[PDB]
């Protein structure tokens, strides 16, 4: 009793593969047969199944509308085309037999890697604001960090204003310069890896989500934002 | 037919002594055409003095060869792990080349 | 610089084989190549030699007769027939350059065992 | 995107996340459900690093053949227990309980044994 | 500056594979491209090399006849077809530009797996010994340890006597049964998972590495030798 | 009883060769005839099978695809066809006559060893790296060793930084230069044969696996690792 | 140039012991003269120094006001006499001449073994909890392990809470008697060697620090705590 | 059933010290007890034993005639008097209940260190060279310091007879030395060479440095 | 300036936590009425009971432990290691006026 | 990426001078920098070439004993210690980064000329 997996590999967003599983040991024609996947670090997730000629075949409600699950019970073969990969894709995946009441997934492939990415990385610049919240009163000083992982040529730094539900709003570029109409208690300072953005003195409008930014290259990046509150 | 007699047959050291091995022969070996190899298990032989004195290139300073005639010494003079093999002495003076039966530095 | 050696393997007594050294980093057509052997658990024993045309091939007295060296300058190969093997033959065999005054045997072959039983 | 609202999924908890234990000790491992599992149709799995997964029990207590007897499932409903008597060095790794009750299967989210 | 690789995956043994490897950011053309494999668990080892067209492609010992590295200068791609593939070609294949004096392995791709298997999602038996070694002297006992990590069914498990530079030598079958010719001093014992072999009285002709053996599956396995010196 | 195998040498990769073993003294036509192979220095393993006309051959996924057993019970003689060899076949070669539960592997052949390989008698540069684990914190000096079994050219010796399931990362090349992005704490020193690895003071993103490299000749080799902890 | 030790060997606690030092070939009435000790399988500790006439002599902190040092120029000695010893002070005492800039410590005695113990050790059942530390949510289960290395007579066996700055609680007496005032989410059982507390489905008060305690004999032991976060 | 043990320390060779052994939780009186010692780096070695009284008390050949081994049933404490120590009595000395049949040393105390003691190593090699007449013999002497006046010698004996000067400060041959002997190096790292063998040049040859007060010789390498 | 000897095999064992442990014990002559014992000592620790009579294992010792032999050949059999049980191991004849013990053998 | 240029002049046979060459743009820490030199009227001539630490610096026989060529990294800046200065050495010099297959001498330093005599 084996199933005996193929395909998978690497390839690019967007793109398409096909995987197979051979049994034997068993009566395949028969049998319910499930395909499931997990993540690198991740846990177990079902992704679909199939069974008898006369019942409904299911598939997890991420892969709907872009996987396919199919058979051929003349060569005991089970497939599953993979359409539309995204990178929440990458995962080992896995064919199991489902045996139900009887052993639920009694018999597993031994699984293939499917990953799905454009590049390797990875070498953008990292930017870290901290902290991550700020609980401060009305009348107080914000002071709020930006670490660059490398240097950010001709001090390219901009830092946004954002409240609930709407667009970020400009309030610093060029790591000092204040835009027009924000108001002089914004001041941001720092070169090389280290800018700070200061409120020199809160207003109750003042509390929102700030993010940096670096413009110095052809990969944008923004920090993951400091909660004022 | 000039026979070469290696002893001890046997050396047991430990790293950081110096080994000498000798290679003594039945006659005279024309022009010191004395050479030493270094094999250890499963490998091909590695030269590493000719012309009874010449260290070859990439061999470290650490092996010489000395003597004359009848008499040639290998010295090895601080052993490292790497050292611990099989020696043997060459004459290639005579259209008959032989060897000793070699030296186990353990 | 290097000599790549092929053939060996095992054969019953009274068999044949030949043995095939490939160099290649020197003008082998001027070097005089040595075969060398040696039975498990035993030391170096020179088996025969070849140089130039019009010099002497040169064989050991336990192989005289049965074993013939040769050589294809064109190929850069050197070669050894093996004949009349017995199971004193069993031996890991090698191909050497022999470089006299200026290094004795510089370049080895990796070796091949052969082995001659019943 | 979204091919559905939800997502009414049968959500198996699994505690602890972590457990650092010797040989010879027993592990004793949770899974909580957040509806009943009808007909008990509960399984647990066994994944080294680099394996597929490799079941232990099914029907929440019933031993898969092979499986030796200090493994041990039990319980009903809701609360699930995967234990351990007697924890060998080939025991470590990590543990998956999983519902089949129903036509959408959900595992846990897995319990490290190290 | 940048190398987008794809393909991989499982495949049976025989089989065939291609690797693609996409280059941006440099002057493909005129660069050194490498093939560097890493089996799971184990360290880099390098696969092929190309150059310029006025220079000779290069291959390991390992792969040597059965894969063939290209270049296609026009798209920027380097490719490795992998035929003839082998249990041992199981890695990770990274393409990587070679710099030499200018940065060695300065870009790689990502890597893509490469499995090559036949098997199910379950083990083969696997036969662990102990200890690794012993060091006795003779007229004393030595007692020699095999432990599978599946039962052995029907307890079809063997041990073998090998000497330096000889084939084994069947010592006991079926976990008890002393081969012919086999002097008493040796015995066997044990079932299940847990075995036993027994020297006695050890004899200067006894030190030797011994193998335990199971053949109660197709799948025939060895355990790792005891030396017993 | 007897087994008379014949065959093997040294080939070159890629290369084919054909392994027999003539039987005498047993009823060999009805025989199970397996051929095992034993690498230099390691266990015996399987290899393949061949039994009686209605049972099915079986093969390793090591050589699957590749090598070919047969036999011609008219000459008593068992055959191994070995093509697209690759140096991992590297081993001695045994046939042997199974008896399962009447004697296991109870007949052996004396063995033929069968080397793959297209160098010569001088050996690739060997890298060693010593630690094999060091186990530090952060802001602590990690040196790491790397030597050559002969000397580097041009001191043509690389370092690698491999964090788990990514790919490398360069960090010193020519022994001593720091690749563009690296931060100062690294440092490469030393040349000929004994180089050396410096990380300054530790940082948690440092914990990895350094590799070193050397490309000053035609066979690129690694050294096999330092685990940093 | 010598220091010959004399003293130690094994003492009570509370006790006294007296070591000497008799210095040879130097100008002992001019040197600055110490004590170091170095606990069994621990690191070198500087206990006291002493010098000429006109300097203070100097304690470590653990040993002030229990350990004096003195000298008798007139006989070329050095005394160290030790009051209150306790197992803390068990080590191997050297007496050294410090010769700062000029040796640091350049002359060592041989070292004597001061061992303070008052008989043990022992026949203490053994107490061992796990895991050390559960994090968990309120509602979840929790399950603590209390092992004996022999058998607790009669089951006497309980468990205590301890929350920060507080004292123990006593939760389970007699292996599985609740105590007055539990609530009923706490049980314990198990017999022998083998004890577990069940916290059914915790609460946010439950959060704490659990010790199993056996009372079974004259030596009452404590285990090491689990504590549920 | 406790076994309370105190003394032992660092003493100098000759001295005197008592060891004493405090039992509780059993019938002393009738039980029989031993003293068992351990050297550094070396196994246990039974010492001394003591009966009901019906004394017949044995000891060791190490310890007989130096060695006091007494008990007083009133105090339940076992005591063992250590006269004219030497640096081979240094071990760790245990007191142990014996119970024979019933449980042989089934109690121990804690064990009490007595240490007696208070240089330049010499290291030959190799430890063995088997040869041949007419062969060369070549002996190292390595030392752990260097030798001031290079004065290092070698002897050599042979069986059952006192040792001979073949060579001292390094260099000198000895009156009547054959010139095969020869001598050489300077500092840490000295070489006596014995150019072709004689039959009667098998032996055990030692090196020695008599640069300082210490004297030491080098452990002999036998030439077979 | 001035009996039966004890002989240990093997003088050192590496193993693993789980696997089996069997260590030998050779007298240089029968051991009347079986008196061996076997003690586990653990470094800078006295020596601890394990088993007596050859095959009497102590109180409080566990099972794993197994003693076997009679006259010149005694046996102890350590059969699940744990990491607690890496030790040295001396057999130890208490049937005559000397006693005598093995010199140990360590097990790593 | 640039390379700026110091130094120079008249000077008078037997003389010193030293040349300076600052470097801003790329990783002057790795880069091969090279001087090369050019006579009034005359054709580009390689004087001498620096590099990585544990690689051989080079000189241009004309030069060897003579001139030093020299790197601080920490500083980006390389250096050119002329001695011995002859008439013959008068000459326009230029550094430049030396790229290999990558591009050669892709950027060069403006260029100082240096005139011997009396």
């Known amino acids: 009793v084996q199933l005996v997996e193929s395909g998978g590999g690497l390839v690019q967003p967007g793109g398409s593969l096909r995987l197979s599983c051979a049994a034997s040991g068993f009566t395949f024609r028969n049998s319910a047969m499930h395909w499931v996947r997990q993540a690198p670090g991740k846990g177990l997730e079902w992704?679909?199944?199939?069974?008898?000629?006369?019942?409904?075949?299911?598939?997890?409600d991420s892969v709907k509308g872009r996987f396919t699950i199919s058979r051929d019970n003349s060569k005991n073969t089970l497939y599953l085309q993979m359409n539309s990969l995204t990178a929440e894709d990458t995962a080992v995946?896995?064919?199991?037999?489902?045996?139900?009441?009887?052993?639920?997934?009694?018999?597993?492939?031994?699984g293939t890697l499917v990953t799905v990415s454009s590049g390797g990385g990875g070498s953008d610049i990292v930017l870290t604001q901290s902290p991550a919240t700020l609980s401060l009163s009305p009348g107080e000083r914000a002071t709020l960090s930006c670490r660059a992982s490398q240097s950010v040529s001709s001090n390219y730094l901009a830092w946004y204003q954002q409240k609930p539900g709407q667009a970020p709003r400009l309030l610093i570029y060029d790591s000092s310069s204040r835009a027009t109409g924000v108001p002089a208690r914004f001041s941001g300072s720092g070169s090389g890896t280290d800018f700070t953005l200061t409120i020199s003195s809160l207003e109750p409008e003042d509390f929102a989500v700030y993010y940096c930014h670096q413009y110095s290259d052809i990969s944008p990046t923004f920090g993951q934002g400091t909660k004022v509150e | 037919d000039i026979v070469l007699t290696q002893s001890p047959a046997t050396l047991s050291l430990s790293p950081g002594e110096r080994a000498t091995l000798s290679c003594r022969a039945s006659q005279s070996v024309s022009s010191n055409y004395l050479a030493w190899y270094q094999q250890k298990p499963g490998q091909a032989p590695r030269l590493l003095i000719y012309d009874s004195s010449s260290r070859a290139t990439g061999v470290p300073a650490r092996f010489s060869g000395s003597g004359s005639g009848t008499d040639f010494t290998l010295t090895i003079s601080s052993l490292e792990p790497e050292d611990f093999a099989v020696y043997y002495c060459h004459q290639y003076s005579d259209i008959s080349p032989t060897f000793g039966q070699g030296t186990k530095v353990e | 610089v290097q000599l790549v050696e092929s053939g060996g393997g095992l054969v019953q007594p009274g068999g044949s084989l030949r043995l095939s050294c490939a160099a290649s980093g020197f003008t082998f057509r001027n070097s005089a190549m040595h075969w060398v052997r040696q039975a498990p658990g035993k030391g170096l024993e020179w088996?025969?030699?070849?140089?130039?045309?019009?010099?002497?091939?040169?064989?050991?007295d336990s192989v005289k007769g049965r074993f013939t060296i040769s050589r294809d300058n064109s190929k850069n190969t050197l070669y050894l027939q093996m004949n009349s093997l017995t199971a004193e033959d069993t031996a890991v065999?090698?191909?050497?350059?022999?470089?006299?005054?200026?290094?004795?045997?510089?370049?080895?072959?990796?070796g091949t065992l052969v082995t001659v039983s019943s | 995107?979204?091919?559905?609202?939800?997502?009414?999924?049968?959500?198996?908890?699994?505690?602890?996340?972590?457990?650092?234990?010797?040989?010879?000790?027993?592990?004793?491992?949770?899974?909580?459900?957040?509806?009943?599992?009808?007909?008990?149709?509960?399984?647990?799995?066994?994944?080294?690093?680099?394996?597929?997964?490799?079941?232990?029990?099914?029907?929440?207590?019933?031993?898969?053949?092979?499986?030796?007897?200090?493994?041990?499932?039990?319980?009903?409903?809701?609360?699930?227990?995967?234990?351990?008597?007697?924890?060998?060095?080939?025991?470590?790794?990590?543990?998956?309980?999983?519902?089949?009750?129903?036509?959408?299967?959900?595992?846990?989210?897995?319990?490290?044994?190290? | 500056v940048q190398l987008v690789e794809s393909g991989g995956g499982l495949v049976q043994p025989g089989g065939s594979l291609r690797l693609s490897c996409a280059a941006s950011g440099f002057t493909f053309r005129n660069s050194a491209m490498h093939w560097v494999r890493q089996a799971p668990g184990k360290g880099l080892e390098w696969v092929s090399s190309?150059?310029?067209?006025?220079?000779?492609?290069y291959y390991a010992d390992s792969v040597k006849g059965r894969f063939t590295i290209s270049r296609d200068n026009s798209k920027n791609t380097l490719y490795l077809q992998m035929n003839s593939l082998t249990a041992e070609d199981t890695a990770v294949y990274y393409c990587?530009?070679?710099?030499?004096?200018?940065?060695?392995?300065?870009?790689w791709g990502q890597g893509t797996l490469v499995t090559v298997s036949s098997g199910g999602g379950g083990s083969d038996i696997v036969l662990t010994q102990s200890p690794a070694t012993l060091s006795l002297s003779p007229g004393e006992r030595a007692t020699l340890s095999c432990r599978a990590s599946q039962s052995v069914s029907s307890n079809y498990l063997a041990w073998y006597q090998q000497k330096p530079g000889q084939a084994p030598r069947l010592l006991i079958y079926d976990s008890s049964s002393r081969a012919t010719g086999v002097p008493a001093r040796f015995s066997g014992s044990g079932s299940g998972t847990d075995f036993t072999l027994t020297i006695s009285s050890l004899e200067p002709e006894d030190f030797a590495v011994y193998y335990c053996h199971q053949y109660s599956d197709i799948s025939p396995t060895f355990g790792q030798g005891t030396k017993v010196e | 009883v007897q087994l008379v195998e014949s065959g093997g040498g040294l080939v070159q990769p890629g290369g084919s060769l054909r392994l027999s073993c003539a039987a005498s003294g047993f009823t060999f036509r009805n025989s199970a005839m397996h051929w095992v192979r034993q690498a230099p220095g390691k266990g015996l393993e399987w290899?393949?099978?061949?039994?009686?006309?209605?049972?099915?051959?079986?093969?390793?996924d090591s050589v699957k695809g590749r090598f070919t057993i047969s036999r011609d019970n008219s000459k008593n003689t068992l055959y191994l066809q070995m093509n697209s060899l690759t140096a991992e076949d590297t081993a001695v070669?045994?046939?042997?006559?199974?008896?399962?539960?009447?004697?296991?592997?109870?007949?052996?052949?004396?063995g033929t060893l069968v080397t793959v390989s297209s160098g010569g008698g001088g050996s690739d540069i060997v890298l060693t790296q010593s630690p094999a684990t060091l186990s530090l914190s952060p802001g602590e000096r990690a040196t790491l060793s790397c030597r050559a079994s002969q000397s580097v050219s041009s001191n043509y010796l690389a370092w690698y930084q491999q964090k788990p399931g990514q790919a490398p990362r360069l960090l010193i090349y020519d022994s001593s230069s720091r690749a563009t992005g690296v931060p100062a704490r690294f440092s490469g020193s030393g040349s000929g044969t004994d180089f050396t690895l410096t990380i300054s003071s530790l940082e948690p993103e440092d914990f990895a696996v350094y590799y070193c490299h050397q490309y000053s000749d035609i066979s690129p080799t690694f050294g096999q690792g330092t685990k940093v902890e | 140039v010598q220091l010959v030790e004399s003293g130690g060997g094994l003492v009570q606690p509370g006790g006294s012991l007296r070591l000497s030092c008799a210095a040879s070939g130097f100008t002992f009435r001019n040197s600055a003269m110490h004590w170091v000790r170095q606990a069994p399988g621990k690191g070198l500790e500087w206990?006291?120094?002493?010098?000429?006439?006109?300097?203070?002599?100097?304690?470590?902190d653990s040993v002030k006001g229990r350990f004096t040092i003195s000298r008798d120029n007139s006989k070329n000695t050095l005394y160290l006499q030790m009051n209150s010893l306790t197992a803390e002070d068990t080590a191997v005492?050297?007496?050294?001449?410090?010769?700062?800039?000029?040796?640091?410590?350049?002359?060592?005695?041989?070292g004597t073994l001061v061992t303070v113990s008052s008989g043990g050790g022992g026949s203490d059942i053994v107490l061992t909890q796990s895991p050390a530390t559960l994090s968990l949510s309120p509602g979840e289960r929790a399950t603590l392990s209390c092992r004996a290395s022999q058998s607790v007579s009669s089951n006497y066996l309980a468990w205590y809470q301890q929350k920060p700055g507080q004292a123990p609680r006593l939760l389970i007496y007699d292996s599985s008697s609740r105590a007055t005032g539990v609530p009923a989410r706490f049980s314990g059982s198990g017999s022998g060697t083998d004890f577990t507390l069940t916290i059914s489905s915790l609460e946010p008060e439950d959060f704490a620090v659990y010790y199993c305690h056996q009372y079974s004999d004259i030596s009452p032991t404590f285990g090491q705590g689990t504590k549920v976060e | 059933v406790q076994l309370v043990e105190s003394g032992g320390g660092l003493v100098q060779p000759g001295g005197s010290l008592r060891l004493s052994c405090a039992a509780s939780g059993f019938t002393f009186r009738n039980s029989a007890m031993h003293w068992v010692r351990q050297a550094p780096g070396k196994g246990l070695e039974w010492?001394?034993?003591?009966?009901?009284?019906?004394?017949?008390?044995?000891?060791?050949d190490s310890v007989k005639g130096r060695f006091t081994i007494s008990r007083d049933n009133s105090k339940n404490t076992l005591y063992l008097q250590m006269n004219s120590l030497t640096a081979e009595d240094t071990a760790v000395?245990?007191?142990?209940?014996?119970?024979?049949?019933?449980?042989?040393?089934?109690?121990?105390?804690?064990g009490t260190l007595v240490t007696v003691s208070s240089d330049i190593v010499l290291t030959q090699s190799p430890a063995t060279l088997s040869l041949s007449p007419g062969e060369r013999a070549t002996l190292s002497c390595r030392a752990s310091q260097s030798v001031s006046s290079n004065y290092l010698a070698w002897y050599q004996q042979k069986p059952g007879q006192a040792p001979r000067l073949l060579i001292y400060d390094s260099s000198s041959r000895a009156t009547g030395v054959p010139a095969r002997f020869s001598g050489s190096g300077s500092g840490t790292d000295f070489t006596l060479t014995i150019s072709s063998l004689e039959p009667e040049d098998f032996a055990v040859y030692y090196c020695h440095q008599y640069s300082d007060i210490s004297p030491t010789f080098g452990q002999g390498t036998k030439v077979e | 300036?001035?009996?039966?000897?004890?002989?240990?095999?093997?003088?050192?064992?590496?193993?693993?936590?789980?696997?089996?442990?069997?260590?030998?014990?050779?007298?240089?002559?029968?051991?009347?009425?079986?008196?061996?014992?076997?003690?586990?000592?653990?470094?800078?620790?006295?020596?601890?009971?394990?088993?007596?009579?050859?095959?009497?294992?102590?109180?409080?010792?566990?099972?794993?432990?197994?003693?076997?032999?009679?006259?010149?050949?005694?046996?102890?059999?350590?059969?699940?290691?744990?990491?607690?049980?890496?030790?040295?191991?001396?057999?130890?004849?208490?049937?005559?006026?000397?006693?005598?013990?093995?010199?140990?053998?360590?097990?790593? | 990426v640039q390379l700026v240029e110091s130094g120079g002049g008249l000077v008078q046979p037997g003389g010193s001078l030293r040349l300076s060459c600052a470097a801003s743009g790329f990783t002057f820490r790795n880069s091969a920098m090279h001087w090369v030199r050019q006579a009034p009227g005359k054709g580009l001539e390689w004087?001498?070439?620096?590099?990585?630490?544990?690689?051989?610096?080079?000189?241009?026989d004309s030069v060897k004993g003579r001139f030093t060529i020299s790197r601080d990294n920490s500083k980006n800046t390389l250096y050119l210690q002329m001695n011995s200065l002859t008439a013959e050495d008068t000459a326009v010099?230029?550094?430049?980064?030396?790229?290999?297959?990558?591009?050669?001498?892709?950027?060069?330093?403006?260029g100082t000329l240096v005139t011997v005599s009396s």
């Open positions: 990587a530009r070679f710099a030499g004096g200018w940065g060695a392995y300065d870009v």
């Open positions: 190309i150059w310029y067209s006025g220079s000779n492609t």
